[PDB]
A paper describes a structure:
Abortive infection (Abi) is a bacterial antiphage defense strategy involving suicide of the infected cell. Some Abi pathways involve polymerases that are related to reverse transcriptases. They are unique in the way they combine the ability to synthesize DNA in a template-independent manner with protein priming. Both proteins adopt a bilobal structure with an RT-like domain that comprises palm and fingers subdomains and a unique helical domain.
The structure of Ll-[name] was determined by single-particle cryo-EM at 2.3 Å resolution. The Ll-[name] hexamer is composed of two trimers that are stacked back-to-back, with the palm subdomains facing inward. In line with D3 symmetry of the hexamer, the two trimers are rotated relative to each other by 60° around a central three-fold axis of the trimer. The arrangement of the subunits creates a spherical cavity in the central part of hexamer with a diameter of ∼40 Å. Similarly, in the cryo-EM reconstruction two separate fragments of the DNA product can be seen—three nucleotides of the 5′ portion of the DNA, including the terminal nucleotide that is covalently attached to the protein, and eight nucleotides of the 3′ fragment that are accommodated within the channel. In the cryo-EM structure of Ll-[name] a clearly defined density of a 3′ nucleotide connected to the rest of the DNA is visible at the active site.
Residue numbers in the entry:
A (entry chain A), C (entry chain E): 0 to 188, 191 to 599
B (entry chain F): 300 to 449
D (entry chain C): 150 to 188, 191 to 299
Write the structure that this text describes.
DNA sequence: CCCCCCCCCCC
DNA sequence: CCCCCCCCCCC
DNA sequence: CCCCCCCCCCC
DNA sequence: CCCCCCCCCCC
DNA sequence: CCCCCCCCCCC
């Protein structure tokens, strides 16, 4: 039954371990058996578009949860307020979009509350008919199935009205969530489900009521609940439409239907402080335009075989990249995303031999200096949202036989040829807080062993304020990967950053409820396993004249002393429990020395 | 040449999705100014089904299958396409005649059209009233002819 | 000196009595001597665009303040939370804009706090150089002077960049006010000036942190402080521009200047959760376009004299209206606003005799049935933001000699000819909460003695939920103006409304901290002076079987019983102090019988 | 494609009527420096003399339609390229079709100023109609895959 | 995971 | 035509 | 020339 | 207010 | 109809 498929999917999804192991970084899996009871390191079952799993993942945390219960940390009535990792990404070539990756403690508080009240979500989701977003790309509810549902919903209509909400996630008033769930006139008399949910959301973003912490699956689930209650209001008024998150497709024939729909939709938006993006409002008349047909794209390679020469494969792949970039320019949404999966699947399906793949992607044409890996790398650097897809593509063809040393040399050569523009780019994103672009550049330098772009001085200039946690981690990794440099300068930079960050806070505020919680955990976890040698930390702190004590040297660099400071130590106790059990949140590679090339 | 790389060895699900994408593609072609593209949908689907040499029971499965999760059926999509333009009534009924000869059961088609009409009864009654007041003869004719036939 | 003119203006403005007498309804006066120490009723010195002064004004309250001190009501640390009057107005022919007229108690709390900390505002305003909005159209800082300042600020630039903030007032995060004033990294540790200011603002909108309560002068002053601190940040980075509220005019010559400005402006907007309206972004190249020249408009009437016939005056005025409507269509902002003042000033300056004015505006052409007052009335009904300008124009020409009975008959005839469309309009705005349009129609019916449009049944359908206070007052006035109808049905409607409104609240919430505070004050003030006869209220409440008691009949209609209910009675005590002293907030006319035709 | 790496935007520039209005005495300017035209007998001066002899001592334009003209024009344009490379710019040129890859508007403006300066020095005129910036995702209208 | 056909939307 | 203000729309 | 894959840009 | 020239921007 | 390749335009 339809109901029973929905129920299976939602009992899979609404599990705390699922919700952190794939939810935190917004990962999707296509089969329940992918959710193995072991730590996954060498492969990736998941599909994600934000963060590189081989460096940043929740596998160790999920393994910890699988055997030990952290319910006890999450019984205090008032949820602890914490600062998230602010991580700004491109919306397009011009605009920006803000992610907020919550403190893991606040994430887990919200996570257990949502799984404890999962029926609040599941009854509405299963009763809902208009949402194609209430599957969250999980299991087998992929893009063609959601388009099938949308097509069914658009029956009978000679016209389509398209409506969008402007800046929906990022300006959503969080106290309007209980209005949508329970009725606005019942907000005026807490202790209910929706009020507590709002409180935990604001705790995830430091009691900020402006917007929802975007970039994770719990936020998507809460937003979907909000929007399915919007859908319930519109359905009680007897309207039929398709919604993907905030993209409303209204089928209609007569203008009175359209006008009555617009009045009702305007009314609910005004009641809940929602704003329509009037730029995106458009009526499409039949015959309907469809710019997102992907048939030509996935059938680019029909007439090429493994009997074709490696040169024809190279030129065909190059033409493919140009063709999909042009398709995306023309309005074919997701065409650039399609380049990497379909190249990989064509290489697998045409059954090209490993040594032929090595020749295809490692060949440098002598006259033209052209190499097709370099073209694909430059394409990925054109949009930092493509970082994960590019690195997954590299992983796949490296498995297919493309040598990792050859890839490292190609990326090194690319970076040397473009070093000046790349340094100007790094400076641009550092001044303007373009977090994902800087992250992409540093992650490529970490992955492909680029040690020539930035010297010691620029690397230490990376460790400063207005740098996101992930970039701080990647720069610190770049610095530790170079054995020539000595650790005192990094210790000084990190200490300065920690003190300056704590200076923005009440002196009774715990460190792990503050900004840079993830970098701090990285540091304390490294120090706990002597990559950050305890002797040289002692030397640095002697140089700084810190007073010793019962726990140690009374510095921001000493977790033994830090874990006990602050009035509320709940986040500190949670992260100390993680540190003692050797739960890592940042993967240091197979051999603990920060190499990700396999 | 939409259907060059599909064969009778392809699964019925791929045939369903390929036909759906075909309909969307020709509707977009007609929107872009390709005159007669929507007319082309029915003859070339029928000729592809004949030429790919798909078996009668496979045709029955292709056009009678209701996907349980999505409630999608490809005959219902083609029927709704035909109701989008009443000049398509004859082409739709000829297409139904052809695939019914190809093996698609007439009782299954009747149930599919009945279900479509029940789900859209309110809008269809408003449509009937519209064409009755405004003398839209072919639209009313198409609706009543579907009710007679199915 | 420049400083000393600024100082004079700001010591005039930052006075509590000024800030309520002209600030509450956003009124401007051109001379300090207009701020008389008496109640103004028959004339209006002020200039306002929102609410009709002859019905809604603060003159009685200001007279009360002038002799008695209400500081004592405003010493409790935690400000009482209240609901404002929600009053939605057209933004244009399509979009809407929300006003929130605060509870007078919360207004006065904010008012005294701001005047007590006026130096916080005045130092920044006087030090500011980029704002042409920091004069609030007061005294002699009118439109040409602000344009003079803007012109000076735009010197040296071959290009202008225009930037706007989208939905600035209505989506402003109120906790970002202390960020702008003090620095965002100092929000994390209250008791300071900016935090208390934020708290009083949210108290004005029922502890809602989404947006600023728009439609009054205190909101404009707070928004100007916010924006002048934005200007201080941009000036420290050595940029020069003109700002009107959120309209940024950046003068520049080279594209590097423009790009650096855009990066800095984007950075501050991202820091303070401000969103640029990317639709309004445009660069203008010299030679510069100027679509707002008003020279032809104010010189339409140069070649007409009082020796011209009344027919030529009629036709000239008609052509004038068409010409300014076309000017506004072409992008001449404020051209339609210009119609009424310049017609009035032309009639005064051409020195047309009173009987000639009567003939001009009262003449009905027999063949064409055309009357120029009816055309101007229909123009005003085309945009409800024109209500005040139309009624001021009528007041002026009525003073010039145009008979009020003739105007009443003309408006009556108009309303009879268009009764069907007008009833459909009334229903439209009632279903869709178009508050200002409904207000305009009911205010015309009140002013011009229209008693034929709506019978008793529709008038009682006016008294229901989702109707703003001002429309509720105007409908109740329409009902009391008709002596044929008896008062029991209105008493039943009003009682139902009061009970239903209190049902949305905690049972310990005081009535005058709730929605419909202004309607409730209207009712209680009428009952206190026996327009709402006490005998017939007793009869109604006997019919409803209310239990009597120490104060009276224990109903929502009895202020004696109502004033003592609720845990916090501060708002009730303040409004009871107003009621006892016969301070009215709604003018009932010269002879207390609700006639405004003079 | 290799030359256009690293760029989020492309600037397209063309020279108007390049072959047919090329001042032939500007060839020694491009090859040797304009301030060295004022004191012949050198390579570039003799080359200019033979070109004008091919078109009846006409100094307006280059005799178009043969490979020697293409070689001389390519020498001229590669010296233009040497001037732009010494100022540390990277672009693709086909004859007179300049494809400038860039990311920030300051790069584009500095390139435009330098290019304008050299064009003014050598009596070269930009076809302002063909000037356009393309933003990524880039348009490509010349795919021949369906055709072949 | 298992054992042809895939691959895209949003915030 | 008579005795200021005019003057244009359509088919 | 020799022995699959080609084929187009400019002036 | 008092005693020529005015009149418009925003939210 | 018979025995590969079809299939569209208009009024």
């Amino acid at each position: 039954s339809m109901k029973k498929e929905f129920t299976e999917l939602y009992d899979f999804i609404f599990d705390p371990i699922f919700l952190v192991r794939y939810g935190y970084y917004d990962r999707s899996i296509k089969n329940k058996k992918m959710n193995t009871a072991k730590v996954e390191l060498d492969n990736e079952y998941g599909k994600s578009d934000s963060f590189y799993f081989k460096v940043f993942n929740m596998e160790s945390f999920a393994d910890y949860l699988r055997s030990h219960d952290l319910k006890t940390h999450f019984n205090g009535k008032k949820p602890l307020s914490t600062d998230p990792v602010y991580f700004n990404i491109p919306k397009n070539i011009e605009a920006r979009r803000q992610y907020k990756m919550p403190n893991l403690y606040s994430y887990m508080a919200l996570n257990y509350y949502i799984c404890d009240n999962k029926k609040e979500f599941i009854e509405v989701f299963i009763d809902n008919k208009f949402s194609t977003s209430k599957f969250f790309n999980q299991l087998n509810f992929d893009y063609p199935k959601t388009q099938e549902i949308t097509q069914t919903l658009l029956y009978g209509g000679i016209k389509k009205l398209h409506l969008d909400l402007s800046n929906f996630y990022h300006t959503l008033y969080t106290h309007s969530i209980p209005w949508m769930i329970d009725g606005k006139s019942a907000s005026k008399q807490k202790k209910g489900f929706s009020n507590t949910l709002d409180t935990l959301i604001t705790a995830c973003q430091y009691d900020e009521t402006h917007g929802i912490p975007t970039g994770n699956l719990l936020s998507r689930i809460i937003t979907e609940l909000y929007m399915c209650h919007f859908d319930k209001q519109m359905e009680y008024k007897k309207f039929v439409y398709s919604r993907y998150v905030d993209d409303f497709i209204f089928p209609f024939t007569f203008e009175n239907e359209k006008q009555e729909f617009l009045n009702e939709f305007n009314l609910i938006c005004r009641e809940n402080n929602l704003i329509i993006n009037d730029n995106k409002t458009k009526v499409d008349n039949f015959p309907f335009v469809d710019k997102s047909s992907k048939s030509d794209i996935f059938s680019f390679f029909e007439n090429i075989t493994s009997t074709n020469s490696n040169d024809k494969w190279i030129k065909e792949i190059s033409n493919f990249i140009d063709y999909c970039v042009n398709e995306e320019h023309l309005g074919n949404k997701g065409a650039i995303k399609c380049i990497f999966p379909v190249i990989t699947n064509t290489l697998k399906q045409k059954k090209v031999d490993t040594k032929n793949i090595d020749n295809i992607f490692s060949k440098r044409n002598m006259v033209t200096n052209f190499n097709v890996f370099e073209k694909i790398l430059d394409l990925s650097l054109k949009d930092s949202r493509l970082t994960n897809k590019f690195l997954t593509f590299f992983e796949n063809i490296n498995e297919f036989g493309f040598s990792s040393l050859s890839a490292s040399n190609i990326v090194k050569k690319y970076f040397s040829n473009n070093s000046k523009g790349l340094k100007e780019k790094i400076d641009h994103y550092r001044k303007n807080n373009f977090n994902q672009e800087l992250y992409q550049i540093l992650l490529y330098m970490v992955v492909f062993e680029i040690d020539d772009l930035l010297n010691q001085e620029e690397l230490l200039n990376l460790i400063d304020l207005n740098i996101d946690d992930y970039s701080l981690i990647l720069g610190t990794i770049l610095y530790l990967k170079n054995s020539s440099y000595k650790l005192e300068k990094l210790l000084k930079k990190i200490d300065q950053l920690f003190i300056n960050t704590h200076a923005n806070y009440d002196v009774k505020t715990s460190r792990m409820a503050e900004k840079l919680w993830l970098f701090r955990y990285f540091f304390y976890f490294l120090n706990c396993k002597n990559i950050f040698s305890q002797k040289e930390i002692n030397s640095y702190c002697q140089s700084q004249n810190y007073n010793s004590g019962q726990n140690g040297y009374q510095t921001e660099l000493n977790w033994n002393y830090i874990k006990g400071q602050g009035k509320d130590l709940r986040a500190n106790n949670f992260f100390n429990e993680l540190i003692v059990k050797e739960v890592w949140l940042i993967s240091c590679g197979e051999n603990e020395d920060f190499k990700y090339l396999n």
